[PDB]
Swiss-Prot record, chain B:
The chain holds residues 411 to 615 of 1024 of the full protein. Mg(2+) 2 binds at N188. Induction: By allolactose. Na(+) binds at F192, N195. This is Beta-galactosidase. Changing E52H: Slowly inactivates galactosidase activity by reducing the binding of magnesium. It increases binding specificity. Homotetramer. The gene is lacZ. It comes from the Bacteria. Belongs to the glycosyl hydrolase 2 family. The active site is at E52 (proton donor), E128 (nucleophile).
Length: 1022, 205
């Protein structure tokens, strides 16, 4: 029956139109849970009144909205499969997921959308208890939907919802009937609203959030607000809550607010309805304000939740209580004073990681467990602050932060990366109503939570008039939280605190109308007072976080800089199944959705599954609150913490020489926040033997926090002890190497061992043991490494970029350069045989590098290699200078003395510390969704694999896969280990970088521009 | 002086319609639409978001929007007591120069006093003064004497230029002016509506 029929309802279409976000949708409110019992709200026990529509759901899929049958609303289609909800249909595989970093997947013609939009209709049949129908109002609630949906109840049209991220509530009281009621929901992948969010993440359209049914008494409080006021001392805090009651108003009915901390209440508030005689016509009929005074109230902080429990109860005069609402309360005051963001009277240093809520197995929907698992890692890793970019997180997620610890920054769900100019959608006056809903709706729902310290209007939306208007609205409705907006260059008027993204501390790059300066410079700008927090920094994609130390070093240095959120916490990948059915991670449009940005999407600090990227350890070390300075014997520890004494911190120091520790020292730690504690070691043992003493101090927690198990380590520091130089002499060995010469090859024999050098080749092809062959492939100099994600950048074969490191190397002929023997010679020392080889690498009649190597053979038969490398000034600097060989022998474990055990690079070697290290050979290789050179280790005095011993100072990566193989492969899963183990030894390695993926982020110092390089190492049997 | 077409005298509290987050889209159209159409004209020197709508969050948001879209013209809003953050220049209405009467949450002070208030720098222009209804404008000299006296006071618009009346026809068919709900529409505020400096026809009072 019209207008319930689909044809009438569909057109005029709402989704195409910019203006109407929703039809017949109740105003957003913080969740109450609608439980009648007073105890339950204080208890927080799951409410009886609340109902979950979550469960198996009937599903139908159609290419277009027009396509879906009219008949369905009356009845569920016979064909349609049953799919679990909340779910993303694309995850189900009905429709391939489409990912685009900047471009909207749909063609950009706002507000119009592609004529065929994948549409999924969900029909749910449920039975409503008779008791519910008779009294009160029942409204269906959706935690999340995408992009937009049309709601039909009992074959009757109910509502239209325009925002996926926000919860939408429709009232089903009229629609519901005794016995089972059919529910029909229609979801469209592409909406007029879709234009508003261009944020880059895998795009899945469906119901990714829980659907529940809520029952409210006819007289109930639609919304309530909690506010905190504190003395400068902070000893006494005044908390006032305002409650608004829906529908009928009774003089007799009263609202009581009780504040409960732990199991014991601190304060109680009771008021008659209405308050304050607001100007000028009348005092509010339905609004009551209750003020509760708390003295010495515990204050919520990232280190400590310090939560209070507040229950809002509306009850009769006698009186029975119609309804009960409970809201978690944390007492914190967040304000920007003197251009310095301040929390609870203390300047805040924020270490944060941008969080995208994604699951590879379940896609967009997030398991409750995942948040807890994610939350523990960030808290464990020294991360106190989490930012979600760029949409409101699951309703549950805010609650977890408040209990658990870390600060949360809410973000309005507006992005407009695609539009050119980007500001156009935000800027236009017409679009404001659509824009308003995301900012306005978000504030009401998330305002209550103690954890959130900030409001962010938009991400990458550019600067528009609406943002300025929107920013004003948030302040006026809520004065509690500072508002920051990235867009417009981050220098925009709307943002209280500057949030430059991907800003470089050392140097600044400016794009006309969007200048970017080093953070130190940016604060310094004329007429600028705002505290600056980076939206993103230290991009984690592939190898990442290089020069990470530099950013953090700056943050400590400057009072104004509050630090910035790292991007990004979880790499985004979707599981794919082989014919075998093995699961391989997919990057970019593996599914063939196009155009696919491919690899860049993952952007991940930690593996999805999830596992920690080698980079993550680096973040933990830099992040750690404690600061250690060492003079002589004495060790001084400075506490990062603003509010917390180190009640349960244990400090352990071990001193070892050459990977051996002479002594271990442990001291209890008792430092007040900002406190400095001085610890003096028992005098260190002195070793006559040559080597370098190492002092390592790490802080561990004797008792596990809820996040961390006991014996977990918050922080560690390593300092070299005074160096020892050994004048002891290797010589002399009775055996003398005998060399036999052929035109074809140079052969050296000592004892059992045989060494072969090829004159034509100019490199030594074979090393002989037994009765055995040591290496499959002749040792050669290697000036190249598989390109890192940063080096490749945005460059592609279709659209090559000159700037990218890979392009410079490729243009160079660096990869394809072929060695030639400039000269070669064989000579015999009385005690040893010395071989000198000179090689010139020439591309296109231009020589990129000249390498001279001399091999000297000891009486002992230990072999010493000295290499001299000359690099032309003109040529782009070689990524690495090293010699790589392939060894037939395969070993279970790799033992080396050097920085360990996590892979480390010169740009980011801070995390690593120097000690003897033992690892399974598989460990050395680091799994990546996209394969680039990985697993490098730095500052290693000695490397041991199997029989071979390597002595010298070098960076070594040992893996089955060839460097050539690594560069070739599209995906990590594809690679098959080559027989034997590839070994790479590098005298010097270029810095990984990078602050920005798009442009080379490598630091000037890190690059090997010297143009002259020397390194020597020793090849020793056993 | 252009005025956005928003008034909410009726609502109690009056600010409720403006104040509510939901109502903002409806509110926005009148302020946003008005600026684009009337922005071009040389004559307009001011933008006024609302009249007697009270003070709402939307007004603060709306006020910010007008400044950002257009920086050319000062924005003044009467509501909230006229001391509201949104209005660039204070516009107390029916304020008395000699003496001040205060209604809780909406204090009104003599204009000389009002500029003098602690932490106040804004130039003050009255939305209305010297009500012209019936016999009116008494003590009119006093207001003007004050305006000349004080540099900060910019003077205020008189209310109102034309008395509002509707022609009615007798059985004879002679036309007699009608005040209030002569037609019987109810309840009728009756006489107060005309509020006129000059006769409708028009003749000068
Ligand atoms: Mg974007």
């Amino acid at each position: 029956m019209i207008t319930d029929s689909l044809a009438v309802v569909l057109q005029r279409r709402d989704w195409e139109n910019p203006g109407v976000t929703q039809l017949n949708r109740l105003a957003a409110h913080p969740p109450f849970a609608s439980w009648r019992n007073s105890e339950e709200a204080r208890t927080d026990r799951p409410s009886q009144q609340l109902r979950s529509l979550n469960g198996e759901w009937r599903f139908a899929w159609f290419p277009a909205p027009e396509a879906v049958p009219e008949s369905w609303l009356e009845c569920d289609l016979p064909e349609a499969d049953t799919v679990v909800v909340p779910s993303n249909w694309q995850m189900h595989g009905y429709d391939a997921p489409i990912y685009t970093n900047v471009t909207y997947p749909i063609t950009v013609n706002p507000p119009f959308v592609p004529t065929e939009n994948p549409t999924g209709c969900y029909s749910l049949t449920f039975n409503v208890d008779e008791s519910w129908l008779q009294e009160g109002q029942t409204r269906i609630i959706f935690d999340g939907v995408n992009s937009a949906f049309h709601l039909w109840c009992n074959g009757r049209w109910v509502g239209y919802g325009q925002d996926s991220r926000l919860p939408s509530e429709f009232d089903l009281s009229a629609f519901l009937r005794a016995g089972e009621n059919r529910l029909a929901v229609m979801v469209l992948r592409w909406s007029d609203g879709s234009y508003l969010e261009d944020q880059d993440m895998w795009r899945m359209s469906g119901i990714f959030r829980d659907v529940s049914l809520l029952h409210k008494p006819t007289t109930q409080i639609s919304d309530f607000h909690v506010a905190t006021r504190f003395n400068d001392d902070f000893s006494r805090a005044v908390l006032e809550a305002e409650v608004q009651m829906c529908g009928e108003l009774r003089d007799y009915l009263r609202v009581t607010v009780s504040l409960w901390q732990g199991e014991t209440q601190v304060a109680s508030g009771t008021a008659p309805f209405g308050g304050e005689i607001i100007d000028e016509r009348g005092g509010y009929a339905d609004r009551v304000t209750l003020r509760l005074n708390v003295e010495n109230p515990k204050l919520w902080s990232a280190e400590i939740p310090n939560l209070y429990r507040a229950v809002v109860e509306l009850h009769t005069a006698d009186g029975t209580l119609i309804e009960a609402e409970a809201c978690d309360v944390g007492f914190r005051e967040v304000r920007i004073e003197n251009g310095l963001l301040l929390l609870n009277g203390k300047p805040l240093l924020i270490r944060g990681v941008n969080r995208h809520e994604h699951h590879p197995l379940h896609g967009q929907v997030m398991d409750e467990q995942t948040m807890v698992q994610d939350i523990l890692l960030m808290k464990q890793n020294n991360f106190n602050a989490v930012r979600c970019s760029h949409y409101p997180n699951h309703p549950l997620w805010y609650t977890l932060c408040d209990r658990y610890g870390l600060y949360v920054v809410d973000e309005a769900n507006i992005e407009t990366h695609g539009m050119v100019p980007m500001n156009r959608l935000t800027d236009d006056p017409r679009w404001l109503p659509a824009m308003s809903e995301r900012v306005t709706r978000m504030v009401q729902r998330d305002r209550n939570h103690p954890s959130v310290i900030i409001w962010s209007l938009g991400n990458e939306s550019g600067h528009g008039a609406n943002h300025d208007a929107l920013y004003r609205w948030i302040k006026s409705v809520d004065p509690s939280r500072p508002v920051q907006y990235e867009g417009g260059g981050a220098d925009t008027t709307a943002t209280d605190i500057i949030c430059p993204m991907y800003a470089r501390v050392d140097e600044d790059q400016p794009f006309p109308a969007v200048p970017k300066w080093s953070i130190k410079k940016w604060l310094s700008l004329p007429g600028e007072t705002r505290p600056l927090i980076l939206c993103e920094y230290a991009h984690a994609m592939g190898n990442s976080l290089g020069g990470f130390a530099k950013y953090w070093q700056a943050f400590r240095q400057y009072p104004r800089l509050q630090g910035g959120f790292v991007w990004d916490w979880v790499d985004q990948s979707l599981i794919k199944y082989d014919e075998n059915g093995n699961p391989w991670s997919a990057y970019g449009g593996d599914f063939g959705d196009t155009p696919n940005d491919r690899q860049f999407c993952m952007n991940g600090l930690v593996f999805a599954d999830r596992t920690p990227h080698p980079a993550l350890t680096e973040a933990k070390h830099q992040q750690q609150f404690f600061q250690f300075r060492l003079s002589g014997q004495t060790i001084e520890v400075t506490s990062e913490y603003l509010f917390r004494h180190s009640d349960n911190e244990l400090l352990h120091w071990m001193v070892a020489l050459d990977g051996k520790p002479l002594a271990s020292g442990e001291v209890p730690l008792d430092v007040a926040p900002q406190g400095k504690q001085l610890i003096e070691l028992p005098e260190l043992p002195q070793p006559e033997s040559a080597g370098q003493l190492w002092l390592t101090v790490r802080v561990v927690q004797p008792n596990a926090t809820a996040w961390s198990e006991a014996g977990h380590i918050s922080a560690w520091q390593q300092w070299r002890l005074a160096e020892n130089l050994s004048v002891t002499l290797p010589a002399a060995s009775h055996a003398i190497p005998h060399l036999t010469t052929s035109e074809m090859d140079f052969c050296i024999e000592l004892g059992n061992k045989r060494w072969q050098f090829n004159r034509q080749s100019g490199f030594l092809s074979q090393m002989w043991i037994g009765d055995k062959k040591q290496l499959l492939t002749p040792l050669r100099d290697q000036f190249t490494r598989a390109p890192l994600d940063n080096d490749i950048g945005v460059s592609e074969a279709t659209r090559i970029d000159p700037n990218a490191w890979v392009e410079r190397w490729k243009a160079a002929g660096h990869y394809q350069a072929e060695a030639a023997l400039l000269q070669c010679t064989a000579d015999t020392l009385a005690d040893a045989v010395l071989i000198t080889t000179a090689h010139a690498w020439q591309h296109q009649g231009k020589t990129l590098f000249i390498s001279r190597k001399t091999y000297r053979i000891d009486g002992s038969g230990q072999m010493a290699i000295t290499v001299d490398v000359e690099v032309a000034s003109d040529t782009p600097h070689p990524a690495r200078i090293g010699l790589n060989c392939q060894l037939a022998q395969v070993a279970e474990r790799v033992n080396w003395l050097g920085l360990g055990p996590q892979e480390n690079y010169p740009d980011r070697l801070t995390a690593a510390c120097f000690d003897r290290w033992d690892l399974p050979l598989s460990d050395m290789y680091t799994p990546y969704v996209f394969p680039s050179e990985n697993g490098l280790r730095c500052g290693t005095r000695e490397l041991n694999y199997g029989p071979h011993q390597w002595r010298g100072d070098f960076q070594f990566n040992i893996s089955r896969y060839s460097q050539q193989q690594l560069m070739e492969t599209s995906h990590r899963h594809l690679l098959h280990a080559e027989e034997g183990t590839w070994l790479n030894i590098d005298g010097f390695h270029m810095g990984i970088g990078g602050d920005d993926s798009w442009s080379p982020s490598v630091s000037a110092e890190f690059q090997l521009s010297a143009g002259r390089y020397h390194y020597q190492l020793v090849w020793c049997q056993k």
